[PDB]
Amino acid sequence: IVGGTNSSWGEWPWQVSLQVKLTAQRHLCGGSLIGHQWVLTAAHCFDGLPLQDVWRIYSGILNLSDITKDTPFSQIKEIIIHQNYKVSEGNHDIALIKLQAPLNYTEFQKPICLPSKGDTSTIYTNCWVTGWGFSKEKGEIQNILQKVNIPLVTNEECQKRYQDYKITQRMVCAGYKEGGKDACKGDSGGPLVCKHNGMWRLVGITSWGEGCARREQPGVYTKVAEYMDWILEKTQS
Ligand SMILES: N[C@@H]1COc2cc(C(=O)N3C[C@@H](c4ccccc4)C[C@H]3C(=O)Nc3cccc(Cl)c3)ccc21
Numbered sequence: 001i002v003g004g005t006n007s008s009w010g011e012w013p014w015q016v017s018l019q020v021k022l023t024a025q026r027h028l029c030g031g032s033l034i035g036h037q038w039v040l041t042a043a044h045c046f047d048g049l050p051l052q053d054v055w056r057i058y059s060g061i062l063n064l065s066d067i068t069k070d071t072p073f074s075q076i077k078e079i080i081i082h083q084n085y086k087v088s089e090g091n092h093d094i095a096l097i098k099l100q101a102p103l104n105y106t107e108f109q110k111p112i113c114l115p116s117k118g119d120t121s122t123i124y125t126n127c128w129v130t131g132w133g134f135s136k137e138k139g140e141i142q143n144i145l146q147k148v149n150i151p152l153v154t155n156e157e158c159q160k161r162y163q164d165y166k167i168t169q170r171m172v173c174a175g176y177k178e179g180g181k182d183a184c185k186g187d188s189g190g191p192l193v194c195k196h197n198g199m200w201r202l203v204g205i206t207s208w209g210e211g212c213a214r215r216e217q218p219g220v221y222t223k224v225a226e227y228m229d230w231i232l233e234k235t236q237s
């Protein structure tokens with residue numbers, strides 16, 4: 001996250017860190033807890049070799065530097081990538097992770113609400129993006145979970161900024177005309193959440209953008225509302 005600030009405990013209890021343990025262990029992507037046994041993330045997080053028994057999913061963690069060998073983590077039972085996803089493209093950048101064991105809910109480990117049927121994106125005026133990604137374009141993973149307030153952008157405006165790509169109805173963009181605040185490398189797969197009727201809703205999954213926090217180059221997010229039929233089908237309700 002560029003231009004954000006430190007989060008506090010319990011502010012974003014659905015945020016998870018997707019890490020890979022080879023000989024070293026590294027954070028690679030964000031994700032969002034959506035139920036006891038389900039995480040929603042970006043399909044591009046899985047573009048590498050599909051190695052078995054390497055992913056560790058950390059929840060209930062605010063500071064990655066607080067993770068030790070004794071810190072509990074979830075493991076992957078199944079990865080469900082959207083059927084129309086292609087590696088060389090940004091479309092359908094969404095994946096479900098089924099965990100090997102259900103997590104119990106706590107103040108620091110609980111699900112984001114999925115968007116409600118029949119809600120236009122213009123109802124969302126208070127939106128935030130979170131993660132442990134770079135705080136500048138040539139930066140590094142951040143220890144304390146960062147947060148930044150960000151306005152949603154119209155699909156017409158977002159398309160104007162990315163004329164070499166197709167910004168579809170299944171995408172939502174967010175950012176500032178003057179840049180300065182944005183998600184960045186290592187934030188992809190995490191949440192874009194907007195607070196409505198006292199509850200946070202998962203509006204986007206951090207996906208892509210040209211650089212980070214550049215002028216007139218907003219972040220592009222997978223629009224979760226446009227994948228609700230798919231999410232419900234794959235989670236068997
Ligand atoms: N500023 C916009 C809004 O939020 C963004 C998020 C990303 C982003 O994090 N990634 C773009 C993703 C990607 C998608 C499609 C095609 C190509 C790349 C791969 C992933 C990424 O670089 N991860 C990464 C890189 C180095 C180290 C580590 Cl640990 C993780 C990039 C740009 C923006």
Ligand SMILES: *SC[C@H](NC(=O)CC[C@H](N)C(=O)O)C(=O)NCC(=O)O
Pocket residue numbers: 111112113114198199200201
């Ligand atoms: S919609 C998903 C989260 N809600 C619940 O899990 C229900 C909580 C109580 N049992 C209740 O109110 O009935 C949720 O609200 N997450 C987003 C948030 O703002 O916390």
